[PDB]
Each structure stands twice: as C-alpha cells, then as structure tokens.
C-alpha cells in the first residue's frame, strides 16, 4: 500500500 | 521508487524565486491568465472594442 | 454499428498502443508529428526489441546460401547495419565487418571478385514477423518500456511472466517450423543410417 | 495391458505434436507432462500370488 | 527535495470546460508538444457545429530529470481554457538520508 | 504497382472457396465475376455466399467445362453514396471518423488500382491485358 | 465524368458544367485546335452561374480552336479544408474534406481510361489505333 | 491486423467485455458502441489481443491442415494476411515466410507461384467461433491482463492468475477430448510398426 | 509535382532528389530498372541523406545491369497512419493527416500514366518495346 | 521404439544447431533442455509379463 | 586510449547513447554533439568503456591470429598502441609485453626487431563494427553501469542485471555459431589422433 | 445427439448455448464457422442428413444437481 | 486494498468548486432541502396555503 | 487490524 | 528508500 500525499495547506508569497 | 505529487490549484501566479524555493501553486510565467478562486487558471476575459 | 465491415489497422500503431496500455496509458491515434515523447519512446523500444529478437536466429529468418555481390569497380561488399547476423554457410565463419564492408579475416582482404555465399539474418519489418513473434516483441517491448519509462515494480513482475510465456510460444513456433529430425534430418546421423 | 497416456493439462506437451511426429523428431514438450496410468496393486498382487 | 534525483515520467493537467491548449515540454536537448484539443471521441460534448470543450484529465509524458524539464501551456485560440490543477509522477531516488 | 483490390483465381471446376485479401466496408462493395468467353457477374445470395468475412463460397463449382477459366474478386466502393454523413447535431464518434476516412481511402485505392481496367505493366516488364480482348483494333499495318 | 467538350461554330458563350467542382481554380478551360490553348479565367471566361461558364468571345471553328474542353483538375497539394484546433468542427468541413480526395480519384478514373479503357462488354476498347513498337 | 472495433457487437463479445470490466469492479456497459468509455475501449483492445494470442498457439480445432492458398493468375502472388496467425508446411520443415505481405518460398527464393500451395494454417477467427472453454480462457486471460495494466490490484492479480491456470487446464482438457489422439494406431510412426 | 520519377544511372552518382512529399520514409520505393527490376532496401542499399534526397550505399550503373533508378511514392492504403480511438481527444492534426494520406493515394492514382502504354504524337498506342500478354 | 526428442521451450537449446552439427562439434545448449518421451509402464509391464 | 567523442557520430552510436539514456528514463538526444548534456556525455563515456571491455575479452570474430606487426626500419621499434586490447603469441607462452609504448621481448630483453613479429592480437574496433548481438550486449552492459553510477535505481538494477545475462548468453551463442568449433577434427590434438 | 440441418440451406446452426460439441468417437471434425457447424476435414457447412455429436447444451441452474 | 470513508453530516450545503477541492460535507445540488444541525439533511417544511 | 478513519473536524466554505 | 530532509523553517538571530 503506497503512501499518501501529505496534506499541505502550503501558502503563497515569498518563501 | 515511483513517486507522485499533484498541484490542486494553480492559483499562486508567478514567482521570481528559484524553483527550489517556490510554492507548488506558483509558476514561472503567466500572461493573459485569470487566477479564479473556483475555476483555476483561465484565459483573461476578451477585450471588447 | 451498421454493415459487415472487413477492415484492418496498422500493426505498428497497435503494437505501440499495447506498449502504452502495459503502463496504463490511453492509446494514441497516430505515431507521427515528432512531438510525442511516448510515441517516440515506445517506437524506439519496439524497433529495438524487434531488431534484437530477429538477431537471435530462427529457422524462418536465417537465410542460407545468400549471395552478396561485390561492387564491380571497388570489389567491396557492404556490411549493412541491417545485417543482424552474417556467418559462413558451414564451418568457422571468416567474414567480419571492417569499416562498413565485408572483410575476410583469414585472407585479410576486403576485395571479392565474385559474390560470397553467407548465412545471413537481414532485418525484417515488424509486420513480417509471425503472430507469436509479434506478441513476444510487443511483450518484451512493453516490459522494457515499463522499466525505462514507467518504473512500477509490480508491472515488471507481470510483464516478466508474460514475456516468459511469450518466449516459449515462439520456441514452439521454432520447433514446429523447423521440423528437425535427429535420425534422417541430422547432418551426421543420416549418414550413419545407411545399410 | 491397456496403455493410457496421461497428459498433464497444466503442462505444455501436446499429443498433437507427439502423434504426428516421425521417429527422431524434435518436439516441444517436457517428459514430466506425459505419464501413464498404471495399476498400483503390487502389494495386493503379491498377497494373491 | 533537491538532493536526490527525480526522473520525471508523466504529468497531467486537470481542466473543466476548456478549449484547445498546447503543452510544451522542453529539456536541455529536445522539446515536445502535446495538444489538449477538447472533448474526446464518443463524448456527449463533442458534436459537430458546436464548441469543443473538454473536461477531465490529460496525461502527457514528461521524461527525464525534473530539474531540466520546462513545461508551459500556450493558447492563442478563441476557445476558453480552465486549468483546474496539475500533477506529475516520476522515479525518485536519493543515495543519502535526510538527516 | 501490384493491384490489391482485384483478385482473380483459376477456376478448376471443383473449388468453390476463394480468399478476400482486400478490405471492404460492405459486402455489396465486393463484386464476383466469372471470366471466360464472357464476364458473368454473380449474385450476392443466389450465386455465392460470404462464408467468412475473408472467404467467398460459390453455390456451384465453375470451370472450363462451364466456360469460365477464372473468377475475379474486386472491390467497387460507392463513390456517389457515402456511408457516413456528418450532421450539425450529431455526436462525433471514432467509428464514424474511421469509416469516413476508410471509404475515401478505398476509393483512392481503387483509382490507383485501375490498371486492371486498362493495359498496365504487371510484375514482369510486360503490358498485361488480364484475359480480355483488345476489341476494335481493326486493320494493322 | 470530369472531362467534357463542346464544339459550337455559332455565336455562343455558355457551357454547362457537368461535374461538381469545389473551387473555381479546379476547372480548367482549354481550346482544342491545332495546338491546345490554356485560357486564363478573368480575360476569357466568367462564371455566370455555378453550373455554367460564359466564355468570352465566340472562339468558333472559324478559328482553329473549334471545340472547347471543360476539365476538372483538383489540386492535391492545396486542401480547401484544413482542420484547426480551437475551431468549431463543422459537418460541412468534415464532409468537404473527404470530397476533395474523391474528386481527385474521380479525375484519375478518367485520365487512365483516356489513352485506353474498357467498354461495357468487359473488353479493352481501342479507338482504332495501331499497337506500334510492340515487342514479340 | 483485423479491426475489432468496426463491426456489429455480438452478445458474446459484449458479454466478454463486461466480464473483463468486472475484473476491476467496473459496472457492465449496455453497448460496445463508442460512449467515450475508456475502460470499455481498453477492455475490448485487450480482449482482441488475447483472442489473437490464444488462437495463434495452435489447436486441433483451429489448425487447418492441407489448406490450399491460391495465387493471383496475373501476378502469381499469394497474400500472407495479418490474419494468418500461423502458416506452416503440411510436413517436415516449413519453407514459406512473410515478405512484404506475400508468401515467400525461402528455399527457392521466389514469391511467384503458378498454382496453389498446400499449407498448415491458423486463420484468425471471431471470438464467437471459439469453443465455450476457449472463450472463458480468453476472457480470464484478458481480465487478468486488464487488471494488471489499468488497476494493478495485487489481490485481483493472484486470483486471476489462478483462474487463468484453471481456464487453460480446461482448454487443455478440451484439446485432448477434441483431439482424440492415439499413440498406437493414431501415431504417424507407431501405426506402421503395428502391422504383422 | 510527379510522385514517380526516374533518373538515369551512372557509376559516378549516388545521390538522387525526392521532389514529392511523403508522410513516411517507407512510402518511398526505390527500384533499379534495367533488364531486371530490383527493389532496394531502406538501409543496406540506400539511405535518406536528407528529407529530400536518397543516397545509395553502393553505386550502380550499366556494368551492374541497371541503367535507370526509380523513386516512387507508394502511400500505404491498408496501414493508415491515423486510427481514431474511442475516448481519445479529437485533434485537428489527426484529421489533417487522415485527409492528407488518402489524398496522397489519390494523387498517385492520377500518375498511373507512367505504368500504362502511353499515346504517340501520331495518336497511336506505343508499347515501349514491351510484349502484351493475356 | 519411437524416438521423440522433447525440447523444453523454456530452455535455450536449439535443434537447429543440434541437427546441423557434425560429430564432435561444440554447440550452445544445456543437456537438461533436451529430453526424450519415454513409456512409463514398467510396473504394468512386469505385472503383464 | 582512443577518443570516443572526437569523430562524426554514427547512427548506431547515437542510437546506443539514446538506449543508455533510456535506461534511467532520460529522453533521447538528436545529436551527440556537445550541447552541455552531462547525461549524454556520461552515457557515451560508459559506452566507450564497455565497448573496449567486451572487445578485449576475445572472440573468434575479433581475435586476429597470425598478424604481422612491422617495425620501423631506422628505429627497429614496434609500437604497442593503446588500441591493442590484447597481444599474444600465436602459440605457447607469450613473450611480448608493453614497455614504454613499444613492443618488448621479455625473454630476449630487447625492444629492437629487424623484421615483423607474428602475434595473436585484438585491435579496438568501432561499436559500429560489432555484430548486432555484441552491440546489444555492450548497450545493455553500458546501460546497467550507467544506471548504477548516475541513478542507482535498485529496480532498474535488477532488470538490467537479467538483461545483461541474456545479452551475454546471446553473444555466447553467436561466438559458438561463428566459431564452428569441433573437438574431433577441429581440435589441435585430437585431429592427429584420428588418423588410421 | 442428432442435429438436423435446414432443408433448404443444409446448414446446422452452431448454437451459442453449445458449451461443447464433439464427435461420438475418435477425433472431432466439427467446428463453429460463422454460427454454423462446419466440417473441417471435408471443408463444408452443408449436410444432407443430421450429424451425430457428443454435445453439452446449456441447462438452467434449476436443472443442476 | 479496501478503503472506506463516512461523511457524518451532510450539512455543508452545495459547492461549485471542483470535486477534488470540496469538503466531504458539501454536495453538488441541494433543492428544497433543510440542513438541520442535529437531524441532518431534511426536506424543507411544506408550503402551507 | 485495519486502520481507523482519521478524525477530521474539517470545515466549510471555499477550500 | 532513504529518509527525507526534515522541513525546517528554522530562524535567525541568537540561538
């Protein structure tokens, strides 16, 4: 059973 | 090993940072595009004379 | 669909679609345009696999007693890139490739007054292969496509099993086509059977 | 006395190829795929004998 | 993750009620072009005399190193495009741990 | 060069099955004619049958005794009547596009294979009449 | 049929076109005299209607050109229908795209038959011409 | 290669596709006509692929022995169709190959025939014309290959592998029952040895 | 403009121009014309030096037995470059190629005059030293 | 009495090389790949005898 | 060591590099000319390394027996080029070594020759000059080493390991078929023993 | 079991519900060709009288043991 | 492998976003429905003349 | 022992 | 499969 994508709310702008 | 990632919304516009520093939703170029909240990337509305 | 039609499809486009299907991808309607990496990759592997299986040597494609005529002026016989195998008709072979020309290593000469007689395998089209061989090529081409351009290891286990079955059915075709006999068909034993 | 050739259907040897072959022919197949029905009563045969 | 090497295998674009758009995949050596013309054969949306808008996912091959694959979408037609999202798959391997 | 829509076979008086190598969209596009002193066209269900989609079975065996040396299987695709016509309201389908392309392809092939209905070069370097008379040659000098 | 002729000594300009043509450049009009004359469109003939051509000048057998040939020559290189992505697929454009190839095929069925053909009796009908240079 | 998509759908072919679709848990389709169903189109493509592959293996019911292939009288060419899954000689070593879509005598190095040739041939048949056991094996093998390529479920892989083995076994039982082969009097060599 | 053209053969020359447009290299057929007709193979006997020229691996001429070479376009009719698949995006490139490929066959159809008797200046039927059979 | 050489189709030995070989020739192959069909009725043969 | 990258690219060498590039999933390149493609340059370097390695092993087709190497008439030196993958005597124990880039007779302790020496030599050949089976093995081995060094994928490693073994087997079959070796009459010792 | 041909076409229908069709003894000679019984040895779909075959005809689930 | 998810409350109304961006409690259409806090989705109260 | 459902308080509105 | 680099937003100044 392959791993799922990590839930990334992430964001915007400069990082 | 096979890996896969998806970018659910291309709503971040463009970024001028290096690709290693960019968010997944930010691209490199976006011309005449509309970043909708619920429809994703669109063509900008046509210019009506 | 109306009418009792009788139409064919291109076998190369079918072969590529089988290679694409092996990795779960949708089929393509065409194989030209030079802008599709999947079409380019699958076609390159299918040609490479088709070339490789034909070079192994089979009764149907090993041409025996073929004469290659030299040039009338240079007396050179071109060693073609499409000569998958070139051997003597009997005994130890004496011809090698030297700069794209047939070279006699024993006599150390590229020059031939008359045509030489060789046992040659010349590349054929995928369409000219037997059905079992076409299946083996597609199965092998699909397997190397997954390893090179998909990489899923559970697909490798499936396609390894399919290639092994694909190869044995071609080995069955080889034996049925050859009709080989060790009593009277044998080069040596047939002489021993004379009373 | 009855000869019955038992062909393993999980095998690969075809009696089509065996029966049509001439003596000395090379045919696809495995010797394990072909066996013969045999009376297995040797212990009982010796008791009766 | 830039330490390891990611060999891209395939990407996709998610679209809804969109006309034709061209996907260009460029590496350091070659370039490829993929067209999402619109609806698919047999779709209720694909009709003659009617605007051709496709909805769904278009998978296209992006082959090679991820660091050297440029993917961009071009479109100069009068049809609309609505790119919902995208995604990619590839073979990733790093010879060292994240530690 | 070699014609692929016109296949003609020797009639031996005992064989009734003949192969159809070429593609076709309708069985009406396949025309069966017996050649000999004359060229007699056969009927779809009273003179022959489509045993398979690649095989034509004659009801009766024909041969030189009947006056027919050869039998010809020829594709004649309709040119005025197209099998697929697209309409403004119709869903575009892969089958309709395939049939439209293939029909035009057959018509193009039959035009390129029309050396049968003329005097053309066969496999050898010989102009072939294909078993018919050169009528109206009249006087020679 | 894609080729037709009319011989008209009297003053006449109009010639009905039997064949269907997709473009006016496909129809070529020539004068069959001692040597054939190919006529440009604007100077020599106007399309009074889609069906008929009004060839300017009498061009009668008083001149050597006598009969006039109406020949259809569909251009293989030029395609009247070129499908473009982002454009509405029209049933008309789908239909016409097949027709242009068919018209070329129709013209081919007459060019080969021109030098020698087959009659209604299934025989190679010569026009009364000797088979010269024939090898035995 | 014969087109599988271009004729009327038969009940068995439609049933076969829905069997293949069920292998990954897809619901049945009412018709094989194009409805933009990628799964059904994929299933029919694998169905045709497996149909050609099992028929090309060779069986007593589908191997045609002593068939005459006739040449064209004006070209002397015998077509080697892509529907000829196998073409052999009736006895001994085979001499005919495919060269440019026509039969080629590799021993005589000629593709010209003045009369018909007698060959042991396998010709492609419709999935309808297959025996019931062979239809089940084609469907089982197509279902296994369909799941491997388009779903990849490992539990489905194991069961369909076992089903194919059972399906092939029952086709082998059909082969011997249909074949009726005998090593004593039905044997090419031993039957001559039995005369006293 | 012609899909079939012939070049005279001399031992000096090896490159021959392709004037016509071909969709696939296999659609181009190279033949040696002399006392005997010989079809050449894609790589052993020639090659495609450019998109428009063919270079022979070996020079040919009257000594070999062939005085003329032929470059003919034979577009495949049975094997079509486009087959529309159900559930696939309908692309205008597919429609154009399907239209072009059938056009090439029809274009070659109106070049059958080369493989026919031909007509004289006098209007006779001129067999170029060829027998008429059947 | 019938000689049938059973060739394993999963093997690598070719009768094409075996039959064309002269005595003493070196040929690619494995002895395990080539077998012979044998009658397995010894238990019944002894009972019948 | 012969430069691999300083000549025109052949179609086969370009095809070989693209095959090696595919092994790790790199897309093919149109030309082998320097476009700053590190992967293609790495692939060509491994292609050359494997090309030298398999040729140096020694095969009937590339082992040249009885070759005369001629000395310079004024220096009496025979050059031992780096393209001599193997230099041996025609019979018995070999006596020639490499000393300073010139042939050296180790038994006589001299590098001066008044006449040509007869040696069993392997000289480096272009990958284009290799038999098709040997080209496949070279590419397979180069692809395996390329993946091991620059990608390292373990799944690709296992399959390429199997492919090299199959590729070497098919080259082994070519060697025997080309060789035509007989232990009765083609044998150095046994053939004399068969005279009656 | 005897399968009677049509009186006019002389064709014996090869039913889709014929799960197995074989000869009563020896090697079988009948195959399905286009939904009709075909004699492969004689290469004929035409039968003057009914053929005798060993047939398995599909039964209902209710009729099973 | 078998997987299962349950939506405890269908109280999110409708969403016009793509299905991959929607919350599990939001549907596509809801006509004449009442989103109760404790009784889930209901029919809207009848319109009494 | 099959894995449990992850407790998702989740939310509403645009995402 | 070697472990991934832990996502560290990190910081600045004195630590």
Author numbering:
A (entry chain z), N (entry chain y), O (entry chain 1): 84 to 98
B (entry chain R), M (entry chain S): 2 to 50
C (entry chain Z): 2 to 196
D (entry chain q), J (entry chain r): 294 to 342
E (entry chain R): 696 to 794
F (entry chain a): 3 to 143
G (entry chain c): 6 to 141
H (entry chain U), K (entry chain h): 1 to 196
Give the published text.
The bacteriophage T7, Escherichia coli podophage, has been employed as a model for the investigation of the DNA packaging and delivery mechanism among tailed phages and related dsDNA viruses. In this study, using a 300 kV cryo-electron microscopy (cryo-EM) and defocus refinement with Z-height correction, we provided improved structures of core proteins at a resolution of 3 Å, the portal–tail complex in mature T7 at a resolution of 2.7 Å, and the portal–tail complex in LPS-induced DNA-ejected T7 at a resolution of 3.5 Å.
Through the local reconstruction method and by independently refining the Z-height for different regions, we obtained the structures of the core complex, portal, and portal–tail complex in mature T7 at resolutions of 3, 2.5, and 2.7 Å, respectively. Notably, we identified eight copies of the core protein gp14 and 12 copies of the small protein gp6.7 between the portal barrel and the core, as well as six copies of the small protein gp7.3 at the junction of the adaptor and tail nozzle within the tail channel, which served to anchor the end of the dsDNA. Twelve copies of the gp6.7 loop I, which surrounds the outer surface of the dodecameric portal helical barrel, mediate the interaction between the portal barrel and gp14. We modeled the C-terminal loop (residues 84–98) of 99-residue gp7.3. Six copies of the C-terminal loop, with each copy being anchored to two adjacent nozzle proteins of gp12, are located at the junction of the nozzle and adaptor in the tail channel. On the basis of the location of the C-terminus in the resolved structure of gp7.3, the unstructured densities encircling dsDNA can be attributed to the unresolved N-terminus (residues 1–83) in gp7.3. Thus, all gp7.3 molecules interact with both the tail and the DNA end within the portal–tail channel. Our structure revealed that six copies of gp7.3 are located at the junction of the adaptor and nozzle within the tail channel, suggesting that gp7.3 might serve as a structural scaffold to assist the assembly of the nozzle into the adaptor.
